[PDB]
Amino acid sequence: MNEGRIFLYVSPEVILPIMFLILVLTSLTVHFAILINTTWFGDFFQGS
Amino acid sequence: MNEGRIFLYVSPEVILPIMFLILVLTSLTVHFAILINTTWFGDFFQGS
Amino acid sequence: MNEGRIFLYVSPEVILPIMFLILVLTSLTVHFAILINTTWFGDFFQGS
Amino acid sequence: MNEGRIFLYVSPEVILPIMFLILVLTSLTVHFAILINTTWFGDFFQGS
Amino acid sequence: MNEGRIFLYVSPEVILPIMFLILVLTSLTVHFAILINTTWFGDFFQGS
Amino acid sequence: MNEGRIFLYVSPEVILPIMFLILVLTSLTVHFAILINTTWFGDFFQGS
Amino acid sequence: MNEGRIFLYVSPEVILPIMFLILVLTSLTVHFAILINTTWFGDFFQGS
Amino acid sequence: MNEGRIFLYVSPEVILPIMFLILVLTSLTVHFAILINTTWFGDFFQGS
Amino acid sequence: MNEGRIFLYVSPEVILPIMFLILVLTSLTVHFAILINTTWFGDFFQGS
Amino acid sequence: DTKVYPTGLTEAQALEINDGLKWGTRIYFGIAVAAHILAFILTPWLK
Amino acid sequence: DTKVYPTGLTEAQALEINDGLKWGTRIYFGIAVAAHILAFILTPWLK
Amino acid sequence: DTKVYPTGLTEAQALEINDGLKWGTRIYFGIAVAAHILAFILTPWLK
Amino acid sequence: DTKVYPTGLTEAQALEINDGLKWGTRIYFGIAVAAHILAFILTPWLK
Amino acid sequence: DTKVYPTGLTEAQALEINDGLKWGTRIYFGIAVAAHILAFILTPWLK
Amino acid sequence: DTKVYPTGLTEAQALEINDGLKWGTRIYFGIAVAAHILAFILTPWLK
Amino acid sequence: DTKVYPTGLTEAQALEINDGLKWGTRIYFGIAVAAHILAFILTPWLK
Amino acid sequence: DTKVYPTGLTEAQALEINDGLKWGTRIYFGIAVAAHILAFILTPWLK
Amino acid sequence: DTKVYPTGLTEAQALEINDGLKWGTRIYFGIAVAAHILAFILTPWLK
Ligand code: BCL
Ligand code: BCL
Ligand code: BCL
Ligand SMILES: COC(C)(C)C/C=C/C(C)=C\C=C/C(C=O)=C/C=C/C(C)=C/C=C/C=C(C)/C=C/C=C(C)/C=C/C1=C(C)C[C@@H](O)CC1(C)C
Ligand SMILES: COC(C)(C)C/C=C/C(C)=C\C=C/C(C=O)=C/C=C/C(C)=C/C=C/C=C(C)/C=C/C=C(C)/C=C/C1=C(C)C[C@@H](O)CC1(C)C
Ligand SMILES: COC(C)(C)C/C=C/C(C)=C\C=C/C(C=O)=C/C=C/C(C)=C/C=C/C=C(C)/C=C/C=C(C)/C=C/C1=C(C)C[C@@H](O)CC1(C)C
Ligand SMILES: COC(C)(C)C/C=C/C(C)=C\C=C/C(C=O)=C/C=C/C(C)=C/C=C/C=C(C)/C=C/C=C(C)/C=C/C1=C(C)C[C@@H](O)CC1(C)C
Ligand SMILES: COC(C)(C)C/C=C/C(C)=C\C=C/C(C=O)=C/C=C/C(C)=C/C=C/C=C(C)/C=C/C=C(C)/C=C/C1=C(C)C[C@@H](O)CC1(C)C
Ligand SMILES: COC(C)(C)C/C=C/C(C)=C\C=C/C(C=O)=C/C=C/C(C)=C/C=C/C=C(C)/C=C/C=C(C)/C=C/C1=C(C)C[C@@H](O)CC1(C)C
Ligand SMILES: COC(C)(C)C/C=C/C(C)=C\C=C/C(C=O)=C/C=C/C(C)=C/C=C/C=C(C)/C=C/C=C(C)/C=C/C1=C(C)C[C@@H](O)CC1(C)C
Ligand SMILES: COC(C)(C)C/C=C/C(C)=C\C=C/C(C=O)=C/C=C/C(C)=C/C=C/C=C(C)/C=C/C=C(C)/C=C/C1=C(C)C[C@@H](O)CC1(C)C
Ligand SMILES: COC(C)(C)C/C=C/C(C)=C\C=C/C(C=O)=C/C=C/C(C)=C/C=C/C=C(C)/C=C/C=C(C)/C=C/C1=C(C)C[C@@H](O)CC1(C)C
């Protein structure tokens, strides 16, 4: 029951870039959601 | 019936990344819909 | 008549992922349309 | 004249998925346009 | 001058799907422009 | 200088469909810009 | 230094269509920016 | 535990351009977020 | 160290068009940001 | 006859695909006519 | 029979794929009918 | 004649595709003219 | 058995992939059930 | 002459493709001039 | 131990990639835990 | 000389393409200068 | 050693690419630290 | 030396491409510096 055997059926050259892209987009989405839906993080950017 | 035979006609290298993308996008869509259509989860982000 | 013969002319590796994408996007579109165009399902999310 | 001969010059694997995509998107576009530009179908969703 | 010779240099499998997509999108664009920029066709949808 | 030698280095199957796509998109863009930025052609659709 | 030798390393079939797309999009972007950010060119369209 | 071995399974020609695109888009996203969510950097552009 | 060896592993035909696209889009992004976030450059377009 | 075209199909196969598309189009048209009749009956459209 | 088509499949394989899609569509329809009954009971729709 | 071009087609096949496109465009134009007459009659356009 | 299909896999390999997807789906379902219980407890959803 | 370039075409073929593009652009220009004259006459533009 | 799969890899290589992904995931988790602790301390969230 | 590079072209062909781009850029620049002079004359820009 | 992997590279080449990425990352980090110090000095951020 | 890498290029060719990009970046930098000086003089920026 070794999930790594998925790499025997899905080539890493196809899936690994996809998951890297998804990780980047997900982190950017968390940051954007917090930026939009809060007053801080937007006042921290503003400073004083 | 044996649905695993779907991999005898559709290559896993083509379909598995697609459904992984579907999982990611669907989870992000649920989270975004709840974020937009509720006052909490957006007040939980705000805190106090 | 036998519509399965379409798989003799359209490779399943090309058409089946496309129809899976169509099914996913159509379900998401129905859910999003009901979310946008109703007061409930958006108050069910809100709770009390 | 025989329009089926187009399949002798355009491979069905390229054109048939495209026309399926067109059919799906056109049906969704009709439904979305009626949803946006009418008061009913959006009150039928709302119910009472 | 024979414009059919455009198919001796551009493969029909590449260009014909493109022009079909263009035809579909152009018809949808005309319909959408009429829908957006008129009061009728949007009152014909709603009826009475 | 014979600008027809551009097809000895760029295959027509790549450039001619592309230039047709820009022709269509540019015509649609001119029409859309005039439609948006004027009162007529939007009163011509409406009629009386 | 000869900048044509880039064509010994970048296929003209790949780069020339891209730069043609860039030229078209840049011209359309200049026209759109002037259209949006001015009162004339939008009154020239309107006429009298 | 050498992370260079990721290049023995993922082609650098596929992953390196993707990560360069990610770097560019992330820098542009930081700049755009600060531009949108602050009064300065938008008053620094304005000058006096 | 010699960064030119990046072309021994990444094909110039793949990376050079990508970086040209990045350069074009970045310049257009700077111009658009200054256009949007200033009163001048938009009054320079307007003239008098 | 028995000629293979650049798509890899013979004329009979191409005509079979055409007849199939036409038959499916007729079934789709019948279902769409039923749906339009139901819409006319139930929705305020055309009234 | 035993004929290989341009997609690389035989008639039996193509018909098996069709039967599979039809079999899965019925389970999808059953789950959708259950979901629509639950929606009718719980949501204000159709009321 | 009998000359195969980079697309894999001969001149006769290319001219056949052209004639087919012209015939289809003529049918499309006929239907479009009928639709435009109907639009002129029924819609406030051009009135 | 020992038959190679157009995708390049045998029946045993295709069934192994299916079993893996089902096992990962059950783990995902367990985590999702835990997350939904936590959401019900901690959020105003469902009273 | 008779020299095949990386696109698979000879110089004469590319030149006659260019001549065809020029002929088509001239026809397009004629139709566009007619359309612009009609627009000037009918639309409130350049007036 | 020697079989080559359709992707072109063996079982040992596929397990090495999995172990690598798991190790990088643990490092990412550690950095994320540190970042979340800092966010809890500084940002007006969860308090 | 007579060397074929990974793109399939020799130095003479690559320099021909460069000379062509440079030659077309000058005609584009001339038309752009004419258009900018006309814009300066006819539009409120730069006045 | 002297073993070609599915990507067509050896271990030494893959490790050289890794060291290159790490060296470029350090240069980028230095420039970014300088830019962040300048931002802290000039911008109203963190003050 | 005299070694073909997976991209099909030798070290000398790869370094020539790098030198080309670096040489072009300096002309781009000079034009950008001139444009920024003109912007500083003519625009309200940095004033
Ligand atoms: C607008 C006012 C009316 C209305 C009147 C009209 C009229 C009039 C018509 C329709 C038509 C349709 N309407 Mg309607 N319709 C209304 C509201 C709805 C709503 C809703 C949310 O209330 C639903 C869901 C529908 C649904 C539909 C469909 C039954 C049909 C779309 C035809 C089509 O082109 O499909 C395109 C297909 C899709 C969009 C999705 C494609 C699905 C594919 C096949 C999925 C395949 C799955 C695959 C096998 C899975 C593979 C998995 C892997 C192997 C693992 N309507 C209302 C209230 N509607 C038309 C019809 O009946 O045509 C037949 C029609 O004529
Ligand atoms: C609209 C008013 C109603 C409602 C009534 C309706 C009605 C009526 C129906 C649904 C239907 C559904 N609704 Mg609903 N529904 C509501 C609110 C929700 C909400 C929510 C946030 O509240 C959720 C999440 C759902 C969820 C769902 C699903 C159970 C189902 C979608 C079918 C479909 O086509 O899926 C498409 C699939 C996706 C979108 C995701 C696909 C997932 C894929 C398979 C992931 C594969 C993973 C892969 C193996 C991973 C590989 C990884 C690598 C190997 C590493 N609904 C509300 C309150 N809903 C329908 C149904 O039951 O049909 C079966 C249905 O008939
Ligand atoms: C936000 C408040 C601050 C500010 C503080 C920050 C901080 C803090 C940092 C930056 C960073 C950067 N900022 Mg800033 N920055 C500000 C405003 C600006 C403005 C402006 C219009 O005012 C400019 C243009 C910049 C520019 C930059 C860059 C110097 C740098 C981006 C790094 C990066 O990831 O690039 C990504 C690359 C791109 C976006 C474009 C890529 C270009 C490629 C290489 C083009 C190649 C061309 C190719 C060779 C052509 C081929 C042609 C063919 C061969 C024919 N900033 C303001 C006022 N900025 C960061 C930095 O210094 O990192 C090094 C950094 O740490
Ligand atoms: C934009 O503004 C709005 C408001 C939207 C208005 C605009 C609307 C516009 C512009 C257009 C709207 C709609 C439109 C147009 O125009 C629709 C046309 C629909 C059509 C033509 C549908 C056709 C469907 C045909 C199908 C599903 C056929 C399938 C056949 C299959 C799969 C197989 C058949 C078979 C084959 C191969 C082999 C044989 O051995 C056996 C057999 C089984 C026979
Ligand atoms: C836009 O406005 C809104 C409001 C959204 C309204 C608009 C809505 C519109 C236009 C449309 C809505 C919906 C719609 C319109 O058709 C839906 C249709 C859904 C359908 C047909 C779903 C079908 C699913 C079928 C599935 C999952 C089948 C899977 C089978 C599989 C994977 C395998 C089976 C098998 C195979 C291969 C081999 C065999 O050996 C063994 C076996 C195991 C058998
Ligand atoms: C943007 O602002 C708005 C308001 C939208 C205004 C803007 C609108 C603009 C800019 C443009 C609008 C529209 C436009 C332009 O311009 C339309 C043109 C439509 C045309 C040319 C349609 C043509 C259709 C032709 C078809 C379907 C032909 C099909 C033929 C087929 C499939 C086969 C034929 C055959 C072949 C091969 C083989 C033979 O053996 C047998 C035979 C059977 C013969
Ligand atoms: C749009 O409006 C909103 C509000 C969003 C509502 C709409 C929501 C909608 C429509 C849908 C929501 C959700 C949904 C649906 O529907 C979710 C479904 C999730 C599923 C099915 C998840 C499944 C995960 C499965 C995984 C991760 C499996 C992994 C297995 C792996 C990696 C490998 C296993 C193995 C394999 C292969 C090879 C063997 O050698 C070894 C072995 C180890 C065995
Ligand atoms: C936002 O800003 C807005 C408002 C949009 C304003 C901005 C607008 C801008 C920037 C630009 C606008 C427009 C523009 C520019 O610039 C337009 C140019 C149009 C042109 C050049 C059209 C040309 C068409 C030519 C065609 C269709 C030729 C076809 C020829 C074919 C298919 C075949 C011919 C032949 C061949 C091969 C073989 C021979 O044997 C026989 C022969 C038959 C001869
Ligand atoms: C949408 O609404 C908001 C608010 C955003 C909320 C929604 C959020 C949602 C839905 C999800 C959020 C987040 C999430 C989930 O879910 C995140 C998961 C992150 C994960 C799993 C990160 C993992 C990282 C792993 C990495 C970087 C691994 C790298 C390994 C590498 C490069 C190499 C390793 C190695 C290899 C190969 C060979 C060995 O010899 C040596 C070794 C060096 C070991
Ligand atoms: C938001 O910000 C806004 C407002 C948009 C402002 C921002 C604008 C910005 C950032 C940039 C704007 C514009 C810009 C920059 O920068 C423009 C540059 C234009 C250029 C370089 C155009 C060049 C055209 C060249 C052409 C058409 C050459 C064609 C040559 C051809 C087809 C063939 C020639 C030949 C060849 C090959 C083979 C020989 O055998 C025979 C021969 C005949 C010799
Ligand atoms: C969304 O909300 C906002 C506000 C945006 C906040 C969100 C921000 C988020 C989520 C993230 C932000 C940023 C981030 C993360 O996370 C940044 C990381 C940047 C990094 C790691 C940059 C690294 C750069 C490295 C470079 C350029 C390396 C190049 C090396 C090259 C080309 C070549 C080197 C060489 C090689 C190969 C061969 C050798 O022989 C010789 C040698 C010359 C050595
Ligand atoms: C988002 O918010 C805003 C406001 C936009 C702010 C954000 C801005 C940000 C994040 C970034 C901005 C800008 C930026 C960064 O960062 C710019 C960098 C530009 C650069 C590096 C340009 C470089 C250009 C180089 C060129 C054109 C080189 C070309 C060389 C060529 C074609 C050929 C040369 C040659 C070769 C091959 C062969 C030899 O034999 C002969 C020779 C002829 C030598």
Automatic annotation (TrEMBL), chains J, K, L, M, N, O, P, Q, R:
The keyword Cell membrane applies. The chain crosses the membrane at residues 27-46. Residues 12-46 form the Antenna complex alpha/beta subunit domain. One of its GO terms (biological process) is photosynthesis, light reaction. It is a single-pass type II membrane protein. InterPro entries: Antenna_a/b, Antenna_beta_dom_sf, LHB-1/5, Light-harvesting_complex. Keywords: Antenna complex, Bacteriochlorophyll, Cell membrane, Chlorophyll, Chromophore, Light-harvesting polypeptide, Magnesium, Membrane, Metal-binding, Transmembrane, Transmembrane helix. The keyword Cell membrane applies. A bacteriochlorophyll binds at residue 36. It is found in: Cell inner membrane. It holds the Pfam family LHC. GO terms for cellular component: plasma membrane; plasma membrane light-harvesting complex. Its main location: membrane. One of its GO terms (molecular function) is metal ion binding. It comes from the Bacteria. Belongs to the antenna complex beta subunit family. Antenna complexes are light-harvesting systems, which transfer the excitation energy to the reaction centers. This is Light-harvesting protein B-800-850 beta chain.
